[PDB]
Amino acid sequence: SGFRKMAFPSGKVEGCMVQVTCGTTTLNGLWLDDVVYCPRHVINYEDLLIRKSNHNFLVQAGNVQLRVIGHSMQNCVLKLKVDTANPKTPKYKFVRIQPGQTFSVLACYNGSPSGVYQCAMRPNFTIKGSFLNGSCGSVGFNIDYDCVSFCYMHHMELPTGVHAGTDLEGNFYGPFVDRQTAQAAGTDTTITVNVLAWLYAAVINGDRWFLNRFTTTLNDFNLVAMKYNYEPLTQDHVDILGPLSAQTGIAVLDMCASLKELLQNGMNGRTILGSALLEDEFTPFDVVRQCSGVTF
Amino acid sequence: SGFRKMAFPSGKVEGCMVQVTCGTTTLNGLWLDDVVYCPRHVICTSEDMLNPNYEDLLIRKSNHNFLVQAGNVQLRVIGHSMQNCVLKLKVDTANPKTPKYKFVRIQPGQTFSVLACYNGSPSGVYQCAMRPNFTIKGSFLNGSCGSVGFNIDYDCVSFCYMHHMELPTGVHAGTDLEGNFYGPFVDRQTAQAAGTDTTITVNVLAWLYAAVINGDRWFLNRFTTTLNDFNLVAMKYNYEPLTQDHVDILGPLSAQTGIAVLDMCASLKELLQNGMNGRTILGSALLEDEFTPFDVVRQCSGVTF
Ligand SMILES: CN(CC#N)S(=O)(=O)N1Cc2ccc(Cl)cc2[C@H](C(=O)Nc2cncc3ccccc23)C1
Ligand SMILES: CN(CC#N)S(=O)(=O)N1Cc2ccc(Cl)cc2[C@H](C(=O)Nc2cncc3ccccc23)C1
Numbered sequence A: 001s002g003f004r005k006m007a008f009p010s011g012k013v014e015g016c017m018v019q020v021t022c023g024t025t026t027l028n029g030l031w032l033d034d035v036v037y038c039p040r041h042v043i044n045y046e047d048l049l050i051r052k053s054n055h056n057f058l059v060q061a062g063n064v065q066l067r068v069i070g071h072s073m074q075n076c077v078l079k080l081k082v083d084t085a086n087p088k089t090p091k092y093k094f095v096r097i098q099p100g101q102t103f104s105v106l107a108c109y110n111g112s113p114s115g116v117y118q119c120a121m122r123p124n125f126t127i128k129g130s131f132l133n134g135s136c137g138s139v140g141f142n143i144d145y146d147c148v149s150f151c152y153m154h155h156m157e158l159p160t161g162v163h164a165g166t167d168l169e170g171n172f173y174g175p176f177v178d179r180q181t182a183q184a185a186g187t188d189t190t191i192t193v194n195v196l197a198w199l200y201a202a203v204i205n206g207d208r209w210f211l212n213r214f215t216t217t218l219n220d221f222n223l224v225a226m227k228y229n230y231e232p233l234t235q236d237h238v239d240i241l242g243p244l245s246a247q248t249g250i251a252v253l254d255m256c257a258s259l260k261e262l263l264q265n266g267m268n269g270r271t272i273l274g275s276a277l278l279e280d281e282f283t284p285f286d287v288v289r290q291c292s293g294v295t296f
Numbered sequence B: 001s002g003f004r005k006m007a008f009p010s011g012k013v014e015g016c017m018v019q020v021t022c023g024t025t026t027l028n029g030l031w032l033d034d035v036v037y038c039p040r041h042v043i044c045t046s047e048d049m050l051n052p053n054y055e056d057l058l059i060r061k062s063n064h065n066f067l068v069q070a071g072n073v074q075l076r077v078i079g080h081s082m083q084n085c086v087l088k089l090k091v092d093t094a095n096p097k098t099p100k101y102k103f104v105r106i107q108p109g110q111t112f113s114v115l116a117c118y119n120g121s122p123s124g125v126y127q128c129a130m131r132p133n134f135t136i137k138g139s140f141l142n143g144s145c146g147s148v149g150f151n152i153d154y155d156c157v158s159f160c161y162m163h164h165m166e167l168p169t170g171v172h173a174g175t176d177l178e179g180n181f182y183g184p185f186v187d188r189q190t191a192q193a194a195g196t197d198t199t200i201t202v203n204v205l206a207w208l209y210a211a212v213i214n215g216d217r218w219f220l221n222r223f224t225t226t227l228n229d230f231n232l233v234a235m236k237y238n239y240e241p242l243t244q245d246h247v248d249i250l251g252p253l254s255a256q257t258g259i260a261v262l263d264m265c266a267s268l269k270e271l272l273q274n275g276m277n278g279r280t281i282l283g284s285a286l287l288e289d290e291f292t293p294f295d296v297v298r299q300c301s302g303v304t305f
């Protein structure tokens, strides 16, 4: 029993974290094989880059100074070729995630990991992270079997306190740019398929007060959900919730009627899994994984 | 900016997790140097759990009855001994991945990271706190016994908890790494229940100071309180008594934000009376009690917004 916001074990990622210094700027880099990946803002970026030499980039792995033997830019990421391959490089892939997907963040300062937390890519492409100055270059990831899938690299904080970053190929999540200019997160919405997954997790853990005898159509549910700034629920979301629907005996549209009643009438002094808000940062897969004990 | 429930990086602990098998029971062990630490109930059957005589069960076992697996390698057990509710299995190989470590016994209200494991393999990491009733509100399934709780301030791992059992309300009980249980619990299938739980007051105050540091003051008021009047009110909402030690511990956060501890106490009294009225504090509609004053200082910036 129990339901916690759970991150993947961070060990495979910890052995890749390094410190990158260029002039006055110090941030984090990801050392995989003989390449260190970091935000290009550590340095027109091609005009700034052409003026730099390999020796201008100071890379530190623990108490060892790595030697930079080459450099190149790919979108908003800088790739520093080093003369030593990371002996701790895990099996890995670079993957781009969609809004509503969750991942673990290993927050680092000066190339040293300080914490791990779980979070979700918001529909507005920002993440509600916990980062201070020096956290740039911290990475987001998932683990599937023994393979680390790197999906996020931290670049900046927006004026509302939320965060923005790129995939490991340097493409931003969101309409953001890596420069000091007027940028703002768009109006955000609630990840509906995730709230439904979290309601199924509550039923699995014995919390059933919100269940009712009613059902709804997908169209009527979406008309109601659009009114509360909830993301539209698609037939794909309904299909994805199939396993949890069969385990608990509550049809997806049956749980949608519960969600509609919670949205129109509130919780009324009651909580669900120790929360007085509807939680949207657990995917259907996270719920199945935490209620089954999948290991890495 | 931001404030998340943050766990310590688990790598140093992952390299210590092993699987321990004794007959039909399989659970997790912590391999540090040449010793594997695990719950002594690994030698029990489910029948034995009503009134186990661990000393009588243990004397009947030999070193080769304990199967220890580290990754895909079988470790050889060369000795065994019991210390309170933990079994210490001497192995013939020292763990080359043993970090710098200490065994520390924590007090209620203290937080720690849990590396939940099944079959000696880590599945997840989460942050939690020792409740005032000595239980933990964890996320554990069957096979999670032997999973450990820890803190890593600097490069030293301080092991503070080993998981032993789930109580009927879904909460969890366990021991320090010397095998002493937290609370009035026993490693027996006896009628045991968690006592009435309370809110960790010093932690809610720390979390209110974190909210002020991150730029939110809507909950503050122009009032102050004596420590005695605050405790008389707090006890009525099932909040733990606030001691002079707690007030002393909140000193640094008080000096950083410019808000006296008893003035923050007055704001808490008002929040308990009024609720949040549709508002949130650090993205939560409930008062959070699983961040200590130390966690707030570690995570938050040194410059108030
Ligand atoms: C006003 N700025 C951000 C804020 N507030 S700033 O500090 O001047 N900043 C400007 C800027 C612009 C573009 C890009 Cl890609 C990065 C940055 C930097 C940035 O965003 N850094 C930070 C990242 N993550 C958490 C941070 C918490 C605090 C400070 C800074 C953080 C540096
Ligand atoms: C009724 N039991 C617990 C429950 N429900 S039990 O499974 O029969 N259980 C009895 C028992 C008694 C004392 C001691 Cl020291 C250990 C145990 C075992 C135990 O607590 N195991 C588990 C630990 N942590 C989470 C668990 C979630 C699910 C199942 C089992 C878990 C085995």
Ligand SMILES: [Cl-]
Pocket (backbone or CB within 6 Å): B105, B106, B107, B110
């Ligand atoms: Cl303590």
